[PDB]
Design a protein around this nucleic acid. Structure first.
Length: 75
RNA sequence: UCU
């Protein structure tokens, strides 16, 4: 557990899994990407990748905004 | 701000 990243505020249009892959692939090997409207879920193969993504990408602009990035709690 |  703890190997999934939650994104809380994606734009509601014009967002692809590939966009998310380009942003988050530097942090580790991504196994799965799910988008449910404003919510993104990126499954890595380990929990450190999620922590690294939150620490580095929270400081960045993506899709013209500051993304809400968290350890995913979703079952 | 959790399919």
């Amino acid at each position: 557990m703890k190997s999934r990243l939650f994104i809380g505020n994606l734009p509601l249009k014009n967002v692809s899994k590939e966009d998310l892959f380009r942003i988050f692939s530097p942090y580790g090997h991504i196994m799965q990407i799910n988008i449910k409207n404003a919510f993104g879920f990126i499954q890595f193969d380990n929990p450190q990748s999620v922590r690294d993504a939150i620490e580095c990408e929270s400081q960045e602009m993506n899709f013209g905004k500051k993304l809400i990035l968290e350890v995913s709690s979703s079952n």
